[PDB]
Amino acid sequence: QIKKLLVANRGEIAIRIFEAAAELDISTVAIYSNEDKSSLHRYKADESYLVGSDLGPAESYLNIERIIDVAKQANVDAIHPGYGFLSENEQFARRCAEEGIKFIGPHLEHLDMFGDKVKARTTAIKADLPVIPGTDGPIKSYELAKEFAEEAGFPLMIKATSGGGGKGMRIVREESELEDAFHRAKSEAEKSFGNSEVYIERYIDNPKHIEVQVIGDEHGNIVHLFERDCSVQRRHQKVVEVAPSV
Amino acid sequence: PKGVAEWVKKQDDVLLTDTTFRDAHQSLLATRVRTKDMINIASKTADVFKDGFSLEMWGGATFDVAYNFLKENPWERLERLRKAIPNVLFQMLLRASNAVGYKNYPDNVIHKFVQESAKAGIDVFRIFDSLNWVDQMKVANEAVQEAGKISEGTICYTGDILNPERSNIYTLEYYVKLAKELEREGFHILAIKDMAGLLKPKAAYELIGELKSAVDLPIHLHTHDTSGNGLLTYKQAIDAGVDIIDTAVASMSGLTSQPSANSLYYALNGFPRHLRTDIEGMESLSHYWSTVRTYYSDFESDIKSPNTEIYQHEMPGGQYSNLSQQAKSLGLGERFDEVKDMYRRVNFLFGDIVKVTPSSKVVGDMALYMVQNDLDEQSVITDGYKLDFPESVVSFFKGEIGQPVNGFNKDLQAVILKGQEALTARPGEYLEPVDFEKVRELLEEEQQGPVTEQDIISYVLYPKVYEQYIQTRNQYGNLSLLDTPTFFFGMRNGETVEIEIDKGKRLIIKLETISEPDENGNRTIYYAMNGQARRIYIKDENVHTNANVKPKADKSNPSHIGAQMPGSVTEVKVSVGETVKANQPLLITEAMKMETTIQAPFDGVIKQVTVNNGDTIATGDLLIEIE
Amino acid sequence: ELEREGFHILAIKDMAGLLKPKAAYELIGELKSAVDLPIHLHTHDTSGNGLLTYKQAIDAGVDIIDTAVASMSGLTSQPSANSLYYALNGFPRHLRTDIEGMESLSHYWSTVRTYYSDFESDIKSPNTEIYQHEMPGGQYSNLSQQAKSLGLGERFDEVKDMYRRVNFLFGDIVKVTPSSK
Amino acid sequence: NVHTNANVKPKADKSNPSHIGAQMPGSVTEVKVSVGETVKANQPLLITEAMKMETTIQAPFDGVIKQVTVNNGDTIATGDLLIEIE
Ligand SMILES: Nc1ncnc2c1ncn2[C@@H]1O[C@H](COP(=O)(O)OP(=O)(O)OP(=O)(O)O)[C@@H](O)[C@H]1O
Numbered sequence A: 001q002i003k004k005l006l007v008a009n010r011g012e013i014a015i016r017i018f019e020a021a022a023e024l025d026i027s028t029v030a031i032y033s034n035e036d037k038s039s040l041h042r043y044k045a046d047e048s049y050l051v052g053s054d055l056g057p058a059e060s061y062l063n064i065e066r067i068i069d070v071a072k073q074a075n076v077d078a079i080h081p082g083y084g085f086l087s088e089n090e091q092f093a094r095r096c097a098e099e100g101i102k103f104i105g106p107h108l109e110h111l112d113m114f115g116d117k118v119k120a121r122t123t124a125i126k127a128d129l130p131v132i133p134g135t136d137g138p139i140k141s142y143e144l145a146k147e148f149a150e151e152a153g154f155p156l157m158i159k160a161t162s163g164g165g166g167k168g169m170r171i172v173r174e175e176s177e178l179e180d181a182f183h184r185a186k187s188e189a190e191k192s193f194g195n196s197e198v199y200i201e202r203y204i205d206n207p208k209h210i211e212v213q214v215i216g217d218e219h220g221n222i223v224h225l226f227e228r229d230c231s232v233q234r235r236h237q238k239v240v241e242v243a244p245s246v
Numbered sequence B: 001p002k003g004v005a006e007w008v009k010k011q012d013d014v015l016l017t018d019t020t021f022r023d024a025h026q027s028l029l030a031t032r033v034r035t036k037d038m039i040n041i042a043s044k045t046a047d048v049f050k051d052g053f054s055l056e057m058w059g060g061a062t063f064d065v066a067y068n069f070l071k072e073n074p075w076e077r078l079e080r081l082r083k084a085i086p087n088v089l090f091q092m093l094l095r096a097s098n099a100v101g102y103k104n105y106p107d108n109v110i111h112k113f114v115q116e117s118a119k120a121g122i123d124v125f126r127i128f129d130s131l132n133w134v135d136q137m138k139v140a141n142e143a144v145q146e147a148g149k150i151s152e153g154t155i156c157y158t159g160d161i162l163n164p165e166r167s168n169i170y171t172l173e174y175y176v177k178l179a180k181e182l183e184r185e186g187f188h189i190l191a192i193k194d195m196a197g198l199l200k201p202k203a204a205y206e207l208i209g210e211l212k213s214a215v216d217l218p219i220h221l222h223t224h225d226t227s228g229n230g231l232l233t234y235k236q237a238i239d240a241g242v243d244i245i246d247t248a249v250a251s252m253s254g255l256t257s258q259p260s261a262n263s264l265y266y267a268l269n270g271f272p273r274h275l276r277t278d279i280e281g282m283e284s285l286s287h288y289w290s291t292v293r294t295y296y297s298d299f300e301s302d303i304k305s306p307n308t309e310i311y312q313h314e315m316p317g318g319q320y321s322n323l324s325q326q327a328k329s330l331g332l333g334e335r336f337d338e339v340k341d342m343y344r345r346v347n348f349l350f351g352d353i354v355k356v357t358p359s360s361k362v363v364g365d366m367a368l369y370m371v372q373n374d375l376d377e378q379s380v381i382t383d384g385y386k387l388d389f390p391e392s393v394v395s396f397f398k399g400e401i402g403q404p405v406n407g408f409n410k411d412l413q414a415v416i417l418k419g420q421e422a423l424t425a426r427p428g429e430y431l432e433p434v435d436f437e438k439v440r441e442l443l444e445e446e447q448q449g450p451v452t453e454q455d456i457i458s459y460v461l462y463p464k465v466y467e468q469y470i471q472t473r474n475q476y477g478n479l480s481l482l483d484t485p486t487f488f489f490g491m492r493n494g495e496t497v498e499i500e501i502d503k504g505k506r507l508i509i510k511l512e513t514i515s516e517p518d519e520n521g522n523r524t525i526y527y528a529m530n531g532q533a534r535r536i537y538i539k540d541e542n543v544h545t546n547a548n549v550k551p552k553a554d555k556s557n558p559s560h561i562g563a564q565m566p567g568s569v570t571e572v573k574v575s576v577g578e579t580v581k582a583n584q585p586l587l588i589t590e591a592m593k594m595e596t597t598i599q600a601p602f603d604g605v606i607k608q609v610t611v612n613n614g615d616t617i618a619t620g621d622l623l624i625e626i627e
Numbered sequence C: 001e002l003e004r005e006g007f008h009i010l011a012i013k014d015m016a017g018l019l020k021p022k023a024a025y026e027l028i029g030e031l032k033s034a035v036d037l038p039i040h041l042h043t044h045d046t047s048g049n050g051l052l053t054y055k056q057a058i059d060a061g062v063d064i065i066d067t068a069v070a071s072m073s074g075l076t077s078q079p080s081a082n083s084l085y086y087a088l089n090g091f092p093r094h095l096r097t098d099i100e101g102m103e104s105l106s107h108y109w110s111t112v113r114t115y116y117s118d119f120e121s122d123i124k125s126p127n128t129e130i131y132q133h134e135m136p137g138g139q140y141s142n143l144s145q146q147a148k149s150l151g152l153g154e155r156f157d158e159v160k161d162m163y164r165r166v167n168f169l170f171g172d173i174v175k176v177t178p179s180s181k
Numbered sequence D: 001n002v003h004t005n006a007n008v009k010p011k012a013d014k015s016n017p018s019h020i021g022a023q024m025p026g027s028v029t030e031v032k033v034s035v036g037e038t039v040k041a042n043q044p045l046l047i048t049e050a051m052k053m054e055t056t057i058q059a060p061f062d063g064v065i066k067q068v069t070v071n072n073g074d075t076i077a078t079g080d081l082l083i084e085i086e
């Protein structure tokens, strides 16, 4: 029942989706912006479409309205969001169902549930999973801050209240430089993400980052496809990954 | 159809038919305007002419010129424009004898044509006989009636009703007789086709006045502005009650085109009746057409002034200068006044006939012919037995364009025909019906397979041209999607062109560089075509093949003969793939006014020859290979 | 006033070709009562309605009109005398002149005009936007070289619009040389 | 034979009936007659090529070719004398 597919994305992943799509005899639609005008991925689908010349630089793979209207113009059954743009965006997927188009991903409730790093942690606690201490929720002021700081432990890390890019975090080791941390990494979590809601948890020393792959269908069956070791990081940012872990 | 017409009669406003997609560029730009340029403003045009009567966007020369010169399917032009402009009537001009073609046809060709043209979008057929012969107009009319569309019954205008000394025949009473008669044939609308712009302002007023009195049908006036009096004419037509007039946008108007709709708009301020259109959007339409028109500069008409000598000689449309061009080809350029005069005289020699394609070519041909052979009205008859009249005129006197209002001079006919029988009946009645099945059979065998009805009559109508359109389509695919500048010029080094195939399907093409020609006159083009490097090979036609670059002889290879010095090929002597002995002459060069005959080292089969007579050569150039 | 000043002839000079046919009728009509001067009328066929303006003025009793020979007529020139001669057939008043001689002159000027092709304007079409902006004879195209000659020739839309506005800004003036400069 | 199309034809006398001049620029494809041959009105004299279009130049009347100005593949401007006939 999927006949047209649009990818709300660029580059390798876009192309990758286009490959699977063709392999399933599904027609493909690409979107592109002004300077992507040369990007390979745009030439590798069956139809391609400029996404608002009105739009600007990078803020144009992000324009929900202008992109759904493009989908509507080509009768698209389904949108693949790839990763890293609207892929984690609540509303985008809502406007998709609201307009007869099948968002290619989790259920609306799921994006909301993990759409935020507190909720994620709360949802986890209820699923009865081990989790990092830290705080019951977000933290404004700095009075809020010093409290938990002189209470449990001292290696601690204040961090962004969402988003999968490790740019807005910062680690507190010792008494005082706590000052900066809160702010330095509050409104540098600003420029990175939407806002700068930030909390603090334990900072676990010398950890390995292991992630598990899951897939499920629309009929209650779910498998995992094992781990990846993503511990080789520069920022808090993945540089080399291995599957499965060693 | 009946109801539309009734509707028109009610309208206080003057309605208009836009001729920009057809008549305007047929007159001004040799009918060269491409689908591409029409399509791009179709959505604007739909808005502008929302209350227009119709758009004339088909017929006349467009069928044959689209398929032939522009290499594009006139059927696509109609179907695309039809989808884009779903709200105004589409009108075409249909000559009664042969619809849109170049010949005579059995009646089933007329029927099949109108049948398919109705189907694909055409709502109004302006039917006209080139001799105002009603009888020839009955086949087309029926076909339009059975198709459910609107049949527009046309009278062509000649002479001058203001002037009783002009004709005893082309009178107010003739035109009234013809209109009343067209009405009984049950046409929905009376059209007056003033193909030569002969309808002087008062004439129009008197003429439309009478017809409105005479017939209950709505009247559609069509004129060209070639005397410079077009707007005046329409103005008077309007005081007399005319229902519809044919106009063009300012920038595609004037001279031998339709009168300007933008002008007509303002000309009428302060008068009883009002043109029904958006000027705001016609100024806009005008600007677009003004720029696009520049794409077509190579086909601009010669004409640049009003010409009132029209009222003596009556050469319709462009003819008063094609014929001048034509007269120059025969040494008569200094004597064009004598041709303009012979044009008129030949008209009376022929009974005084209506002159449009194809009758006007007849009269033109005779005139050229008579001045060329120092001939007059008497000697044409006296020496006629030993004269070779133009094929067009023998065709005319044979009955093959139809019956002229006044009949044939029996003696003149005798002399032109030299025995040959004339038709006693309209030409189409003589012809066997076309077996359309046999035609499908053939086209499907020639092509892929799947062939349509539009393929079928297109072929019947235009066998050669159709065939050729098809070879072109096989070679280059759909030319009609190129933008006009690219279509006419190609691309310059460094350009990126953006061809639209379909909603979200384009080709981005960049031309990078072109190589010098290889030994065969082939240049290598380097493109990029969306995202990928691409190389194409094209044959150059030099003017002089001294430009061509020859590969270098492999020196450590006994098969390659090299150029031992500069010079010229004075004579090629052996050809590719051919036997020669040791010490055979196979190429004579010239060094510095010195012969030397490059000869074969061993017994050989000549593998290659990279040279023609009078090619440049430089030291170390591969001239020949031998096995 | 001009009659009072002792001018022998009253001329209406329509430099921008803005005298619409009906206007021409009513303006020459009234003037013919108002004063005893004969009326000499001058127009430019830039809108494409010059002949019509002439015919209406003639109905209204105009005395003299400025015309040009066919091949040197039309668009921003005067209307064609050759055209008017016939245009008037059947109407009350006839143009006093020799068509046959005029056809002859047209032909002469036709070839001669060829010597001057480096000098023709781009103007090749009537233009009825003159009624919004009011630029007299030349200007419209002149004032286009100049606007590209300073990199504004991509929004001559706005120049045209500013031209009109400047006009009212200056309290709405007559526009010929040199007021149109 | 260093220039071949860089010879200069004279200009046809426009007021001489026996002078045939070029009507536009282009190319001689094929000379079809010699100085001396007799011809009939309308005979092929010359095939030229303009911008990828072939025009055939014809005898204006019957007569005698007196000079032929061009060779296959020469180029010509409007006004160049191509042929004299009597
Ligand atoms: N509480 C913590 N203690 C120590 N290191 C941490 C902590 N939280 C995050 N990090 C570091 O940041 C990395 C990823 O941070 P986080 O889980 O917030 O991912 P993200 O920034 O949302 O993006 P992603 O997890 O997809 O890489 C971890 O691999 C780890 O190196």
Ligand SMILES: O=CCCCC[C@@H]1SC[C@@H]2NC(=O)N[C@@H]21
Pocket (backbone or CB within 6 Å): B068, B069, B070, B071, B472, D052
């Ligand atoms: O001839 C050289 C270039 C090839 C151009 C072909 C185009 S296709 C449309 C037009 N009609 C023709 O027969 N040829 C040109």
Ligand SMILES: [Cl-]
Pocket (backbone or CB within 6 Å): B235, B236, C055, C056
């Ligand atoms: Cl009038």
Ligand SMILES: [Mn+2]
Pocket (backbone or CB within 6 Å): B023, B195
């Ligand atoms: Mn016509």
Ligand SMILES: [Mn+2]
Pocket (backbone or CB within 6 Å): C015, C137
């Ligand atoms: Mn003036």
